[PDB]
């Protein structure tokens, strides 16, 4: 993952977010700060907030990261796809974790129903929630989810994915 | 998978079941015939029926398959384990399907909450529900689930697993 791709990973609330484009920001729902009246200096009313389960997407009415190109955001990825979780730590440390993705489905995790995709790490911490799952397609990168959960032990993680009905996912 | 292992796969209700031992039979809950007053000629009262979600286990008070040895039944298997789904078709055809197992979790599938493990086929049909997921450990085979679901397209399947709390599963 190149420097510019990492610059998209942003500290947000109790976790992190990812700039898909100059105006689009995605993150995990449970890290989004409520009680606030604005995000990155933009009033809530000037933002289109779409939240589906643990997947949250913000569309600002103003270019927040005009330096970035738009990049492709898909709903999860095919079974077996080896992604990379672009985890940033508060210290600044980068911890890219390779993971082979599994099935997409709605899973009951810690009481809440999470629509995402699990995967097997090839460790994560609570504060990592929001980190983007990415993978390379040709010479460009694609983001397909945001870190939403991990098992206590073992090597299982889950990235929440955007809403969407498909035949490849467990409905 | 040897002949004796396949002889454990038994037609049951709208699907199939698996003889773990002379007295233990496991199958998928939604294939179990209700309204009946007995199973394999044994009155319901003489059977200990344990059903947890889509996982059902029968313990008969009498040896039904005294020809079989007991074999190991575990709750799912480690991420990445390549299992084999011992699918039998009504015609008699054997269709062993290789699948690399994924995460264990409670998934909302077709309205119902299924506690199982998904996997990627390396196709199944409704009537296959109940087929055992098995894998070889040393010189012996181990069963760790029963077919409970499959995606419309793609290569995703799910085997229901017995109840049990663990740190490697998404709780
Ligand atoms: Cl950066
Ligand atoms: Cl047989
Ligand atoms: Mg997986
Ligand atoms: Mg899988």
UniProtKB/Swiss-Prot annotation, chains A, B:
Activity control note: Inhibited by the chemical compound K36/GC376, which covalently binds to the nucleophilic cysteine residue. Inhibited by various macrocyclic inhibitors.
Peptidase C37 domain boundaries: 1-171
Effect on the protein upon substituting residue 171 to Q: No effect on 3CLpro activity
Reaction(s) the record says it catalyses: Endopeptidase with a preference for cleavage when the P1 position is occupied by Glu-|-Xaa and the P1' position is occupied by Gly-|-Yaa
Location of the active site: 30, 54, 129
Function: Processes the polyprotein. 3CLpro-RdRp is first released by autocleavage, then all other proteins are cleaved. May cleave host polyadenylate-binding protein thereby inhibiting cellular translation.
Record's protein name: 3C-like protease
Species assigned in the record: Norovirus (strain Human/NoV/United States/Norwalk/1968/GI) (Hu/NV/NV/1968/US)
